Amino acid sequence: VRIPALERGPGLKDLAIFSRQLATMLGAGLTLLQALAILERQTENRKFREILKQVRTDVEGGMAFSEALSKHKIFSRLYVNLVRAGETSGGLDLILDRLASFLEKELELR
Numbered sequence: 001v002r003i004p005a006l007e008r009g010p011g012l013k014d015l016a017i018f019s020r021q022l023a024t025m026l027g028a029g030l031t032l033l034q035a036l037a038i039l040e041r042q043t044e045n046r047k048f049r050e051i052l053k054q055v056r057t058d059v060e061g062g063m064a065f066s067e068a069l070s071k072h073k074i075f076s077r078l079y080v081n082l083v084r085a086g087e088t089s090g091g092l093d094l095i096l097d098r099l100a101s102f103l104e105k106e107l108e109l110r
Contacts, residue, residue, distance in 0.1 A: 010048040010074045016107050018043065018052070019100035026093035033060060048074070065092075 018039065025035035036056040043049045051072050058068035066084035069075040075083075079099060086095035 007047060008045070010045050010051065012103065012107050012110065014043075014045045014048050015074055016100065016103040018048070019096055019103055023093065023096035023100045026096055032065060032092065 021039050021042070022035050025038065026032070030038075033056065036052065036059065040049060040052045040056055043052055051074065054071070055065075055068040058071070059065055064084075065087055066080050069083060070080045082095050082099060083092070086092035
């Protein structure tokens with residue numbers, strides 16, 4: 001039996017909450033790394049928490065945010081591609097706000 005396969009991983013809800021949190025902190029003026037350190041402490045799903053600690057570690061080491069995300073299935077191609085556009089435009093706050101709103105509405109539908 002593959003025990004890890006049995007563990008509840010991040011859901012739509014988990015991703016929506018994460019995205020809103022980050023949106024909120026980036027919009028308020030916190031840096032990406034400041035926001036991630038706060039988020040990695042306030043994430044409910046253990047597997048998502050482990051994911052986000054790895055993302056923050058990667059970024060703190062100098063890897064791009066979009067590439068750190070791209071390591072993890074929970075982030076779709078469009079999500080990563082949009083985040084990638086944000087890195088180069090200095091509009092991550094706007095990108096994350098729109099992704100979060102999209103996800104929140106997907107959530108309440110489902």
